[PDB]
């Protein structure tokens, strides 16, 4: 399942994840490709703030959904 | 006005323009521009991306768009074509990179010298603008952090005051090469379609297509060209469309299973609508010329020649941003995974001997696998005629040992050549009892014997019966992967099937006649 | 008694019957029934399916079954023909689809309105019968799931006891639209051949072909026509045969055909006619933007042929030249003048004669194929819309000049066609569906108002003074350079492999056997 | 009249029928009572497979007699 | 490469695959075509049940071979 | 002449320009002073969107005319 995360410049990167993944796992991936540690990562989907702990399937992250990354 | 959402892979501008442009082409309102150079360029780029676009024309463009009606289908078909055509309209790249670099230094020289990481730098200007997006998109580890190092290193000579005009001047003096290298890295970015895009970055193409991109309702009533209305909320592009949206979009479900990246690489051919036929004129082809063992010319082996053909297809495909052949090759042999740049770099007039040795080894392994799969398959019992076995290239090679002809038992060309066990077995054959035209009465049960063992009956060989672990047939088969095995067109046939390429074999004296064609 | 294995692509019944009927045809036992209506229909469908089935006779058909004697080759060339011919014996598809839909809702009323998925439904009856196989064959995303949604909607009006008869009457009252649409879909289902088949669905056909079908040895003692015995173990059809004829009429040639089941049934890839790998002609393209010495296609091809002739002369054979005179007698008794051709500076007189010959040959072939491709096939004109000549004709609608160059498109400057073309209500044209208007037009311009499209046959003579045939006569004329498309037909006729390099194709040499 | 149809499920079907009805007619009536399509139907009477087009009187099927229904396979 | 898969009613589906595909891959293709979750798919070649993670060439499943699909718990 | 460009933050830039210049040229000057890439720049004078190829004289921009600069959004 391919998810995209988008910065405030419009720049997007692609991540290969599963619905069972939690936001911690994602934040670690983002840290691998862009270097930002999960402390300073704040992810948002559908205007909801997303917290490390619940999973993609709980926030209803589907096949090619796009998340917002901010610091 | 209804709003159509576009997927957010980062090329949302190209997806949105793809959707709106599709509505405009299907509506008929752009037929007058069919002949204009912009839309001829569009049909050309479309053809370069989709090999099954046979009648390369407006009618079949409309046919594809009406067929692949779903908007995601449309994006996969057309957003890479539009992304490709846009590159043909980039004038100021040099100025663009230089300016992005002066932005990066001028707002973070302090941060650059203090060892700040890339995510810590200021990438946004006072107006909300993005300061250096093209650089921003490059890989952090391979390019961005080393960029910070090279910049800190160069900045020792910066003894003027920290002003933008200063930084620009200094950079044109002391970072000439740095800028050159970065221009190469940006124009080669494998994920450039995912960095953000503003409307005006497409202007040269939109102008050439007689189309105005209208952003967030900010219209210019003086502009009377046909308009694609775009909507940007939260750094994402969507399409407005008026009666039209229902008429030309999402009438059918999504037919393509393709990732954005695979589409831009053109990894799998989009299949043409059923009303059209394949030309196959332009199917990828390898063109070879037999020289004889007596007069070998430069004496290349079959795998060398074939590998050169593949490499040529690779580079030619890179010309229009497709990595099709290469990604197929990696599909067949993971060890090729990281040689795309090394393959594009290969000089075909003096090719790099070691990398070519690697590709030849790959080809020998691929054809070994395919050849033995074909062996097992061909040995499944169908008929007492064994019509598939006695035609199997490798079985014919095995049988060539019987006729003793030295031309058909060359170690360079026949993997079974000097199989001591096989030749013993065939020394124990009453050849008087063997009448001409019936040698296979003995050779077929012998072969199967050596392949699966005396125990099993030829009539019972299915796809599950495993070859003898000790089978001398398999070990003679293993020579295909050996340097001293030159190979023949026989071995290259399996490769033609594996890389989905058309193999053409000139004879040494075959003539070629030129002619004008469309 | 040995079991011959049929490809399990869903048409295993048609594959098995193709194999058994094949041994019967070559075996001679059906030479009595051969002139009957059923085998005349079989022949007609065979020629309808294979544009290169050149002489329409059984002589040729037995040739084909002998040359393409691999069992998979047999399935590939005959199973689509048997499928087509079987369609000519179906009678009441309306009632069939009604019964299938009522079965669906009868056994899945609650299932459907509960929002279940298709795979979760009951598709089999108490005796093991398939409840709705044709419906089941339709694509899930396109048709099946939407149908479950529509049935969910109209089932809100079902205010009756849940019985099969009540469901039938309900669907007659409330689903006439749905039933009509489903009829269109199922009748045009391009994967219909994969939906699995029972013997009696072919009964009509088999009776017209005088053959009984024996299922798992359960023979009818009362039945006494020639039989084809079929084993069905795990929902798959294989054909039993005696060892003796097994070895004489099956698998007595190598496998020759490289093509998928779907490609065979659809007609995308034509099969080549039996021959009695080949010589090769090698050409390289040039562009109009950048020509070489400006040679036309027919010139290049003729030079290739002459090289093949001279080569065969060195080995003291005239095979190719013989094949040429059988195509055009005007060339017989030119052997020596051709052999004496200085290919550095070839004689212009003779070469223009040879090119003329080639142009007429390619016309004969293109017109034969076009006539095969206008034959009525129950509404399907995909083979016709793929025809190179129809593509050249339809290129005039949206008139891009590159597709209307007079040297390459025979229809380029035909005023009557350009008239009818420009006088079409383009608003009535559905975008991407221009064919809907273009293929009737074409048919008209080829056969006139004199013959209804649905009546066109392999024999229907095209109307004379037709603008189509007038335009194609341009390929006989000498201002027509031709394209690789025409050279494909020439490659058909002379039995050569045509290889066309691009302007920039590289050639690597290797040492070979 | 009335005839009976027994199959391997142990269930027996009751059909209202006239001796001029054809085997095709009987199969259609079974498809009306049960869901089973006639192309998967074999009807047997007195160890003889009944062919479509011939009538019930052609086989002496008379009031209150019984036929065997057997599934014809598909593949 | 074309593979076939046959259901209990005899209906057959055409899959496009490569020898290196895992059984999980083929089950995902079947999900795409017929909607069955892979946990409810049971594939059998010639009497042998197929295991996820093993590849199509581990069972020597070649072009135009036919697998048998059955529903499970 | 010396003109100004104003921002929706009220911020103004002063630009030395000549009437023969192009709007593309003025955008290049704005980039040299402030850093805004011309691809993210929109210039409005007297309620009109300014085209890259035309000239300040074409729109009658005079000395100490005020232009307005708005951010073209990225996405």
Automatic annotation (TrEMBL), chain B:
It comes from the Bacteria. This is Dot/Icm T4SS effector. It comes from Legionella pneumophila subsp. pneumophila (strain Philadelphia 1 / ATCC 33152 / DSM 7513).
UniProtKB/TrEMBL annotation, chains D, F:
One of its GO terms (cellular component) is nucleus. It is found in: Cytoplasm; Mitochondrion outer membrane; Nucleus. It is a peripheral membrane protein. Its main location: cytoplasm. It comes from the Eukaryota. Keywords: ADP-ribosylation, Cytoplasm, Isopeptide bond, Membrane, Mitochondrion, Mitochondrion outer membrane, Nucleus, Ubl conjugation. Residues 1-75 form the Ubiquitin-like domain. Belongs to the ubiquitin family. This is Ubiquitin B. The lineage of its organism: Eukaryota, Metazoa, Chordata, Craniata, Vertebrata. The chain holds residues 1 to 75 of 93 of the full protein.
